[PDB]
Each structure stands twice: as structure tokens, then as C-alpha cells.
Design a protein around this nucleic acid. Structure first.
Ligand SMILES: [Mg+2]
Lengths: 153, 203, 149, 119, 50, 121
RNA sequence: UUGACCUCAAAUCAGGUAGGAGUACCCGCUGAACUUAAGCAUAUCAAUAAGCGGAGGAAAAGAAACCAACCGGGAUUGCCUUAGUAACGGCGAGUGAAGCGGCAAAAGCUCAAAUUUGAAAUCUGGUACCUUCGGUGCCCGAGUUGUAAUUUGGAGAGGG
RNA sequence: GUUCUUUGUAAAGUGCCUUCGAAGAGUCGAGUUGUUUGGGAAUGCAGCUCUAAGUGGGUGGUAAAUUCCAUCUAAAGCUAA
RNA sequence: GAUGGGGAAGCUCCGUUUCAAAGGCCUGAUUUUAUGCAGGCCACCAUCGAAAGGGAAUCCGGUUAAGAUUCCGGAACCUGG
């Protein structure tokens, strides 16, 4: 069918043409061993799910009922940061410690400026395979970017 | 904020990155139908600046229309009149290709409401637009008072009555001395200044 | 066609002008309905005076700058000098124009004085309680006339 | 004469069905007499009584279906209101009275004051 | 024609039922202005055009 | 991985599980009664002299029948209304627009005996 | 092998919506010629009639990328006037507005572009219950390629 | 007017100091062609070609270069009489 | 002459197997059983268009004011099950 033909001939055309270096600055992605161990590192810092958020809020409401702490019974979170405008603001504020960029964002113009911005602001970046992998890292479908900004000792 | 990067990158259309990307996407859009549903906006910054929000009930279609003039549809070029009206070839349509694109999209999805449109690509034969549409029956637009004005029945076929942005541009609706013919409606002003007003006690 | 010693006439009646003839037979009935609309509006806003307070302001061109007249609304600088915010002035019945400026100290002082007299003359009711009824007048323009300096 | 709807309304549906079939038997027996007699005005009363019985049966069944669908969304279209197509497509009072929280804050902070002007 | 359609036969049946004079008790009603069947049709004088 | 073997160059639309309708509400919510019952398919007999000659000679009843009724409905309703077995039914459409049915009865029953039981002779 | 994502489909899938009529008035497209010029081709008739698309009780326009040149005015619409004027025009026939002034009515506004990042705080649907133009609980889903709060240039934001 | 819920450890406004202040692109604009206008070296609209900037841009009814000044803030949107 | 498509500002125009993921057919298997899952077969590809073309099967006698290869009596035939 035509959808199969279009989705094959499109990736045929995208290498038949001479791509300008801002594209194919991608497609040198991370190798699989270092990618596996960086996702193993990132899996320890996962954002909270809805149920554990809900019991966290019940514990906070009980704690401000009994002791009236200013929402400070729970400790400081340590989570991976995601969302494109969020991590661009983090990179511009120099708060990001390590940024992962998905290699298959389907407007590529959403993420072509990201390695140059990371190089200018001095933040280390890695083009990694799988916006679906980043999404299952941050409990979404697709995430298209991820960032560690502050890590435990 | 990535959206201003997307804007100021989008203004460099003859940069090599954008003309490569344009060259791939225009082939991809010729391979599809003339009117087809886009899954997400190609320019999300442009969509949300024209008024799109990524929630349920906001629909994007993609559309191509034929470029060039409007040939006068007469048999064998005979106009049967004075020589000032014998022109056939170099006549121009008074509305825009963006306008006829979103009007065909509205006829395709008559249950939706056309909000805006934007240029995405072109070649010698076609111009390519993306049309933002909002569903006035979805409860997320029945509620959300920022957008429930589109559910009022006076907004049926705004693109057909020329009430979108390019429709008002083509109708000439603007303040100023350059728009004296077309300011409250051309035919309305013509009737207003071609009416003969007679009072009871004749002035 | 052209004839005896008469002036050259220009009567623009070469279109289908009889299709657009508006004879105002409804002048009297339109006036009656207009007074009915004013009365029902006054009954609907039963304490309030049916029109906002307008500033005094200098007419634009060299033909008319000898005269002074009523404007659209007061300047934000004028209402800040009067000592009340623009939102509060709009709620208590003062027209505010965000887009005119003050370049003339006499016009500025006249409008500030006019706001002071309006604030002295009005009664503002509490939002909740007694509503001490106060026999409306219908024209803030007539209670604060525009005076030529 | 004929039957009365208020006394028809106290019966059950099987008695109404039996009364309907005896009314139809009577109507057939009057129609076979209409051809021999010159005039027979008694047919109209039986016809209107048949109409009355059918009306009472239909209203009983419709009220039973209304109480079956009572207190839930998606009731059938002939049971829900008719008024006009445009009034059915119009916004409800809740959706029309939906306001943004920013406008709600502005309306609470600065409502239209009631004031009078003499002193 | 002998082989006719049911639509044509239905219209023929209606015109056959319409082909009658005035009922004679109509003239005895109060404020009666009807004198005769003004819509009478004969096969020799005018055609149905169906 | 290995791909699926295809012995045909044609690609067909795959077979999809098609569910049945489970509506949230009924369509009309009161089912209509019998549109065409036994009392509606048989209006009245025809008692002209031509018809009355048939009821002892041919053992044939003649009825006026609604225009929506066929021979099965006519036969079933004559059997239900008069408790008589019938031999055959022949119908026509009269030139006034009504429908006439000649119902020939079986030899066990006598149409002359049945007609004055109905009430016409 | 299994589980995702993206894109594209199929269902008499759950629930909805569009078409047609009317068309005096309204918003657009398209578009003549008779006529006048004592002929006629630009012009005029006319940015009209006919044709096509789309609404409402009004529609449209509307809160300045305005008018002005003054001691400046201050959204839009309509009336009186400007004015048969400035101007256009085989500068022929003919055409032809707008600013100011008086009055009627008066009403203002909101998104995008900002990191919530110490917690997507947002929303459709299904189900159960209830006081049912809806509310609450639960469950999927939408959504980080950005749904809420915060600000709209008259400002406003972050700190003190 | 009379009554019940207390919304709300919430929200809003106002003064002074400081650092800022994001503002819409195949668009604006230009050439040419056609149509239109009272609009005249070109009033608006539309086709094709070229295609911006950020103390910037538009307008200021005679084309162009140079130096100023005035006045607004486009290419997104709602709204009674 | 629809559909898939492609023109057209549009009323609508082209085209009829086309740049389509275009469907139904029999055996059954199972006997919570409904008809999915075992299977396997096939790719035309809407529909309309003849009371003179193609086409399953009825003849004789009698009968009415007016009907008959249609009713009555007798004697047959075809199709589906
Ligand atoms: Mg064309």
C-alpha cells in the first residue's frame, strides 16, 4: 500500500540527497553498551507515578495536619527532567548536568538546535536512540529529550 | 522555550538545512492525497501562535491547491461583449490560495470549524497549507471558556464568509485612509453612499 | 439637452436610484421607541445616572481649537492624580481612556478638578447591605456641565 | 358515547388488549351492516373508542419506558425533548456560564458598583 | 396501454373517483356558494397528461 | 529477524474483528404493534350480484382487502377470523383503487353457510 | 520470542455532527449587456441584474501598525453636515469619497512568545452513587513535539 | 427583602528601590501583470518573481537621494447598543 | 452512472477498472457456543439499460350483461425444499 511505499521511499530519499551537516550531526548515535549503562543510571532517577504521588499528598496533608510543616515533611526529590521547553530553559540557565536527545524527532527542527546550544552553554549532550525509550524512562509514550540536572552523592 | 528557536530558524528558508528539509517534505506531501489529515502540526510553534492547543478536539489537515491565475471559464475564449472584457488569460482570483484551501478543508469536514491556516511548502504547481480546525461538539471546547465562542452558531463557515485572517485580508478590513472603499464592507459602504435619504420635513 | 441661460446641474440619478430610497416615515415612532428604551434602561440601572462622566478636552484642528468639548474618557495619569485606580473608576462610573495623553497642564488640572467634584457628589453603596435609596438623576453631563474657560 | 379515557386508565394491559379486540370485532360487525343499511352513524363511536384504547396503551408503555430510563444519560431520542434543532445544538446554561478563573478573579475584585449621584 | 404501471393505474383510479357530479345536499347548506362541479373532466374534452 | 513468506504479489486488507452493536439506548423504545393484522387485511365483503352468484356456485367468498396484503396474509387471516380451511386465493386491484380477493374454500366448508353466519346474504 | 513507539487502516464499534428549505435585510465570490456619450472602441450603465458559496435576529465591523499637524483628538456603527467638494474622466459624457463639528448609542478586552520543575497542579470518556443544563469517587485514555496557574504592551514579570 | 452555608490559613488592589521587560515570516516590503478605486509616478485586492529587520516596522495622499520630526504597533483572537 | 481518485471559487466535471489495504465461498471444526477460532479456495471488481433481443414450466372443453392460456371440470409440466 501507499503508506508502506511512502514510509520506505522517504527514508530512501533522505539518504539519496546530500544532507546538510546539522542533520547527520545526528545518526552517529550512542553505542549500545554505553547507552545501556546510561539508561541503567537514568532508571534510578524516575519521576513519581500517579499512585505514589497520591499517597505522597495524603502523607503531606496528614503531616501538615499534625505538625504544620510548610509542605516540607517529604524530602527533596531527585528525578530526571523532561519536556522540551523545560530542558531548553535548564540548558540556558546552565543547570543541566547531562542532556540526552532522541535521534528520531519527526519534525527534526524541534531538536536540531539542541547540540549547538549544548556546546555553546557547555552542557554535555548525547544523541541517543529512542524517543520511545526516553518516554518509557519518564513514564510517557514519547519524551524526545531527557536531562539529569542534579544527582545524588 | 524552544518555540522562538523554531520561529527564528523558520525565517531562514533559503538556508541549506531548511531547503533540504523543504525538498524532502514537498515530495512527501505530493505522494499523499490532495486533502489528508495531519497527525500533528509540522510547525507547532506556528500552530499555537495562530491559536492551536494540544488537547482533544483540535484537528490539523494538510491541503494543496493549484497555483497560478484563474482562466475565465468561457467556451473557446469568446466573451460576447465590449473589448474591455475580452481578457481570458491574465485574470486573477480575488481570494487567496490559502482561502480556497481552507474552504475546501471546511467542505471536507463540515462538522468542524476552521480557525486558521499557515503556509508549509510550495513548488511550481502547488501551494501547501495546514489548516487548524476545532470541534464545536467536543466537551473540551464546550467547556474551556477561552474557546467556547466557536460553538456559537454565528461562526458557521467563517472561511466561507471570509471571517478568517486571510479572509479579512482579502476583504480589505483594516483601519485607515487606505481602506475607505472596504472598511465596514464594500457593498455596505456602496449602499450607504448610494442611498437617497428623504426626511419628513425635506431638507 | 443644453438650453437657455441656466446653471450647469449635476444630478447623479443615472443608476437604479429608485431601488435605494430611504424615506424616514418612522421618525416619530423611532423617537418614541428611543425614549422607551431610555426609560427602561433607567429603570434597569435604577440608581445609576444613565451615562458615564466624560472629561473636558480640547478640540483638534485649527478651526476648532478655540473651543473645548467632551472626550471619550479620562487619562490614567488623571485618575492616578485624582487618587483612585482605573478599574475602580470604571466600576463607579468614570469613563477611562487608556490611549490619550496629557500634554496640557490646564486641561489636566480641569479634569482632575472635575474628578474631585464627581467623587464629592456621588454616593457609593455598600456591596452587601442596606442600599439607602437615593432618587437618581438622569444626566451626569447635566449635573457637571462643560464650561468654556 | 364510547369509552372514557379516565376509566380506561385504571385497567391493565391485557384487559386493554382484550377490549381492543372486541372493539375490532364490533367494528367488523358494523361494517358488514353498513352495506345493507342506508346510514349507520354508530361506526364513528366505535372508531373513536378504538383510537382511545390505542392511545391509553401507548401512553402506558411509554411511561413504563420513561421510568426504565429514569435518572441516566442516553435516553431514547423520541423520549428526550424536541424543542428545535438549533436549541438542541445550543450551549447549555453551565457551558454558557463557564468563565475563566482570571475573569472570575477580576469580577470578584471589581464588580459593577451600585451608586447614585446627588450628594 | 393494457400493460400499464401501478402509478398510472393509481392516478386513473383517483380520477375515476373524482369523476362525479355535485352531491345534491351541498346546495342546501347555509351560506353555500357552490353551484356545480367546476373541476369536472371528460375523456373526450380534455386529457389527463400523465 | 526473518520476514514472513508471501507467495502472492497482491496485498489484501487484513481481516479485522468486527463487533456487534451494543447501544446505550434503544432506537425507538416502544416496538410498534402489528401494522397489518387480521382485522386490517379484511375490510368488508363485496355483496354485488356477481359476487353473490359465486358463493353457492363456486363456493367462493369475495372480500375487500387492504392494498398492502398478499395471498399468504389473506389466507392466514381468513383461517383465523372464520376458522375455515381455504383452497386458493386469487386477488385483483379494482379500477377504483381497492383490492378484491376471491377466496375459494375447501370442499368441507360451504360458503353459503359461512356468508349468513358472517351476516350478509 | 515478547513488549513498546510512530504512521496508516477496519468495524451495523460507544456517542455525536454536516447536508435540504427559506433567503426581505447580511458576509463573500463570479459577472454582463441593453442604455448614455445625439455615431463608437476607453468610459457610463455598474464594482449593478442573472449565477454560486455561507449566517443570524440582526449580520458585519470593532477596541488603532487610526485620524491628524492642532492648545491635538481617541474602538466600531448610524444620522445631519463636510459635498455634488478635493479628486478621477476620449479632462467629454459623466463620476466622486475622507478628516474635523453636532447628535444617537456607548463597554471593554485575551492568546502566542517565560522553568510548576519541590512534584501535569489540566482535560474527554466509561462505571457507581447523588440533589442531574450538573456533582463526587474510581478506572482507562489524552497530554511533556506542553494541558493548568501567572502577563498582553494601557503594560507587566523576578527579587527587596 | 427573609433564610442557610463561610467561602478563605485563599484571592485581589495600592506605595518605594533594583534587575529586566520575551510582543506573531514566503509575512512586511519591492518589481511586474490583471482588476478595482475619487487615489492622481500607481487606493485596495489577487497571480508570479525577489524577499527583510529589531533604537525595528508601518503611516504622514508627487516619484527619488540625504537629514530630521510626529503618530501608532501589523502579519493571532472575542465582544451588547 | 456512483465509489477510489483528480479538476473546478462553485453549481458540479472527468473516469468505470482506473496511481484503492476495494471482498465472499464452501467444507467444516466446536458441540461453555455462538459462530469465533482449525483450515483451504477465488480475484470479478457498484448499479441502471429491451412488455420486438436472451429466457424454467399449460393445454383442451365449458362458463358471463361485461373476464379468461387467469374462473370451473379434466389432464399436465417446471422450480425451490
Ligand atoms: Mg487556476
Amino acid at each position: 500500500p501507499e503508506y508502506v511505499r511512502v514510509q520506505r521511499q522517504k527514508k530512501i530519499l533522505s539518504i539519496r540527497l546530500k544532507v546538510p551537516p546539522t542533520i547527520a550531526q545526528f545518526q552517529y548515535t550512542l553505542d549500545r553498551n554505553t547507552a545501556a549503562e546510561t539508561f541503567k543510571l537514568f532508571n534510578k532517577y524516575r519521576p513519581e507515578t500517579a499512585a505514589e504521588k497520591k499517597e505522597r499528598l495524603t502523607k503531606e496533608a496528614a503531616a501538615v495536619a499534625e505538625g504544620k510543616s510548610k509542605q516540607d515533611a517529604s524530602p527533596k526529590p531527585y528525578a530526571v527532567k523532561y519536556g522540551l521547553n523545560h530542558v531548553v530553559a535548564l540548558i540556558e540557565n546552565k543547570k543541566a548536568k547531562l542532556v540526552l536527545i532522541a535521534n528520531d524527532v519527526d519534525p527534526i527542527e524541534l531538536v536540531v538546535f539542541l547540540p549547538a546550544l549544548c556546546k555553546k552553554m557547555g552542557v554535555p549532550y548525547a544523541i541517543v536512540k529512542g524517543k520511545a525509550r526516553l518516554g518509557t524512562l519518564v513514564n510517557q509514550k514519547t519524551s524526545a529529550v531527557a536531562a539529569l540536572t542534579e544527582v545524588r552523592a | 522555550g524552544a518555540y522562538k528557536y523554531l520561529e527564528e530558524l523558520q525565517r531562514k528558508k533559503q538556508s541549506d538545512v531548511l531547503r533540504f528539509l523543504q525538498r524532502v517534505r514537498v515530495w512527501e506531501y505530493r505522494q499523499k492525497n490532495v486533502i489528508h489529515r495531519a497527525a500533528r502540526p509540522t510547525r507547532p510553534d506556528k500552530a499555537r501562535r495562530l491559536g492551536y492547543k494540544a488537547k482533544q478536539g483540535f484537528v490539523i489537515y494538510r491541503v494543496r491547491v493549484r497555483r497560478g491565475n484563474r482562466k475565465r471559464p468561457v467556451p473557446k475564449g469568446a466573451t460576447y461583449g465590449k473589448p474591455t472584457n475580452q481578457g481570458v488569460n491574465e485574470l486573477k482570483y480575488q481570494r487567496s490560495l490559502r482561502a480556497t484551501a481552507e474552504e475546501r478543508v471546511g467542505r471536507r469536514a463540515a462538522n468542524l470549524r476552521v480557525l486558521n491556516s499557515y503556509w508549509v511548502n510550495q513548488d511550481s504547481t502547488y501551494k501547501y497549507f495546514e489548516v487548524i480546525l476545532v470541534d464545536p461538539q467536543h466537551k473540551a471546547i464546550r467547556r474551556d471558556a477561552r474557546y467556547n465562542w466557536i460553538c456559537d452558531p454565528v461562526h458557521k463557515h467563517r472561511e466561507a464568509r471570509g471571517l478568517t485572517a486571510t479572509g479579512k485580508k482579502s476583504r480589505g478590513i483594516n483601519k485607515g485612509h487606505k481602506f475607505n472603499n472596504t472598511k465596514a464592507g464594500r457593498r455596505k459602504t456602496w449602499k450607504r453612499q448610494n442611498t437617497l435619504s428623504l426626511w419628513r420635513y425635506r431638507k | 439637452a443644453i438650453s437657455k441661460n441656466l446653471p450647469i446641474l449635476k444630478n447623479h440619478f443615472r443608476k437604479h436610484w429608485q431601488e435605494r430610497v430611504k424615506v424616514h416615515f418612522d421618525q416619530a415612532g423611532k423617537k418614541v421607541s428611543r425614549r422607551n428604551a431610555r426609560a427602561t434602561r433607567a429603570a434597569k440601572i435604577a440608581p445609576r445616572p444613565l451615562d458615564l462622566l466624560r472629561p473636558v478636552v480640547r478640540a483638534p484642528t485649527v478651526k476648532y481649537n478655540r473651543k473645548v468639548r467632551a472626550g471619550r474618557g479620562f487619562t490614567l495619569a488623571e485618575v492616578k492624580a485624582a487618587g483612585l485606580t482605573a478599574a475602580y473608576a470604571r466600576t463607579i462610573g468614570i469613563a477611562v481612556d487608556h490611549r490619550r495623553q496629557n500634554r496640557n497642564q490646564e486641561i489636566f488640572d480641569a479634569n482632575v478638578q472635575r474628578l474631585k467634584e464627581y467623587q464629592s457628589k456621588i454616593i457609593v453603596f455598600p456591596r452587601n447591605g442596606k442600599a439607602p435609596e437615593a432618587e437618581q438623576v438622569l444626566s451626569a453631563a447635566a449635573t457637571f456641565p462643560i464650561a468654556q474657560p | 358515547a364510547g369509552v372514557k379515557a379516565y376509566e380506561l386508565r385504571t385497567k391493565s394491559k391485557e384487559q386493554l388488549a382484550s377490549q381492543l379486540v372486541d372493539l375490532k370485532k364490533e367494528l367488523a360487525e358494523l361494517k358488514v351492516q353498513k352495506l345493507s343499511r342506508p346510514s349507520l352513524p354508530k361506526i364513528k363511536t366505535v372508531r373513536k373508542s378504538i383510537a382511545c384504547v390505542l392511545t391509553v396503551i401507548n401512553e402506558q408503555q411509554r411511561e413504563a419506558v420513561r421510568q426504565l430510563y429514569k435518572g441516566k444519560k442516553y435516553q431514547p431520542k423520541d423520549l428526550r425533548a424536541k424543542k428545535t434543532r438549533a436549541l438542541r445544538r445550543a450551549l447549555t446554561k453551565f457551558e454558557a456560564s463557564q468563565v475563566t478563573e482570571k475573569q472570575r478573579k477580576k469580577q470578584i475584585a471589581f464588580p459593577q458598583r451600585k451608586y447614585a449621584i446627588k450628594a | 396501454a393494457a400493460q400499464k404501471s401501478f402509478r398510472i393505474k393509481q392516478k386513473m383510479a383517483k380520477a375515476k373517483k373524482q369523476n362525479r357530479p355535485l352531491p345534491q345536499w351541498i346546495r342546501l347548506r347555509t351560506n353555500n356558494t357552490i353551484r356545480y362541479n367546476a373541476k369536472r373532466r371528460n375523456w373526450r374534452r380534455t386529457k389527463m397528461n400523465i | 529477524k526473518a520476514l514472513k513468506v508471501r507467495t502472492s504479489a497482491t496485498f489484501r486488507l487484513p481481516k479485522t474483528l468486527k463487533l456487534a452493536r451494543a447501544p446505550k439506548y434503544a432506537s425507538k423504545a416502544v416496538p410498534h404493534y402489528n401494522r397489518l393484522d387480521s382485522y386490517k387485511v379484511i375490510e368488508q365483503p363485496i355483496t354485488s350480484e356477481t359476487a353473490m352468484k359465486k358463493v353457492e356456485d363456486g363456493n367462493i367468498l369475495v372480500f375487500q382487502v387492504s392494498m398492502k396484503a398478499n395471498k399468504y396474509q389473506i389466507k392466514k387471516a381468513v383461517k383465523e377470523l372464520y376458522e375455515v380451511d381455504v383452497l386458493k386465493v386469487n386477488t385483483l386491484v379494482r379500477p377504483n383503487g381497492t383490492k378484491k380477493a376471491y377466496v375459494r374454500l375447501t370442499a368441507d366448508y360451504d360458503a353459503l353457510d359461512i356468508a349468513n353466519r358472517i351476516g350478509y346474504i
